[PDB]
Design a binder for this molecule. Structure first.
Ligand SMILES: OC[C@H]1O[C@@H](O[C@@H]2[C@@H](O)[C@H](O[C@@H]3[C@@H](O)[C@H](O)O[C@H](CO)[C@H]3O)O[C@H](CO)[C@H]2O)[C@H](O)[C@@H](O)[C@@H]1O
Ligand SMILES: [Ca+2]
Ligand SMILES: [Ca+2]
Ligand SMILES: [Cl-]
Ligand SMILES: [Cl-]
Ligand SMILES: [Cl-]
Ligand SMILES: [Cl-]
Lengths: 128, 128
């Protein structure tokens, strides 16, 4: 069971911390080109591991595999599974200030909705 | 290089034509559980192959891996790559009638946007 150079092993996956600017869509294409996808956070153990990385690189936010279609509809993971907030809840959530913010990134220790094509860093995940 | 039972080979890929009603999200999940994604159509040859399966099964529509994130914003594929209308264009297209329709499905020979939540068949794809 093995990961590429520069990918970290944790839990049951290999993660790539992409220190390189990009839209949510761009980030997505980029992970998918390495045969991965954007990060999916299943349990709190995974969350905590990721959170160590993001919070020790607070200069920047990292796109994750979470988004929605309806400019105010339900969040869903890259794999299409539904969002349940057992590790975190998505922030900036009041009606008005959520408008157009349909992609999710992590910045520091928080997970925010953000305008999908803001440029940022990202995290890919390949399962084992 | 090989496909699972019931998946059909064509061009570079294995396909599964899934006759089970499900939402776009649902369909997406199901593909992903078999270790695949929803259909991504990279050219006319792929389109035409798909198109004869969809037109010979006009009773239902088939979800595909194309969606957008904001009620009037750019279409993107499951993989993050942007939509170019090489083989077809998305239909019901005037700014007002396609609000809340941010997922795409194929019905007969036409590619429509729809309410992501609607129930339907779907097509999965795993590239060799
Ligand atoms: O979505 C969760 C699901 O992802 C599955 O992986 C696929 C990737 O295999 C795929 O990458 C494709 C390459 O394999 C192929 O060679 O090239 C095409 C086009 O460049 C790539 O799309 O990317 C999709 C979308 O990110 C992934 O879903 C995993 O196998 C599976 O374990 C996981 O559940
Ligand atoms: Ca995960
Ligand atoms: Ca394809
Ligand atoms: Cl993804
Ligand atoms: Cl998909
Ligand atoms: Cl057309
Ligand atoms: Cl048509």
């Amino acid at each position: 069971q093995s990961c590429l150079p520069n990918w970290i092993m944790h839990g049951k996956s290999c993660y790539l911390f992409s220190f390189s600017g990009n839209s949510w869509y761009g980030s997505k294409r980029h992970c998918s080109q390495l045969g991965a996808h954007l990060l999916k956070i299943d349990n709190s153990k995974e969350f905590e591991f990721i959170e160590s990385q993001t919070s020790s690189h607070r200069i920047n936010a990292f796109w994750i595999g979470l988004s929605r279609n309806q400019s105010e509809g339900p969040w869903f993971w890259e794999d299409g599974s539904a969002f349940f907030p057992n590790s975190f809840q998505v922030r900036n959530a009041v009606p008005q200030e959520s408008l157009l913010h349909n992609c999710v990134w992590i910045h520091g220790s928080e997970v925010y909705n953000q305008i999908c094509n803001t440029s940022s860093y990202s995290i890919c995940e390949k399962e084992l």
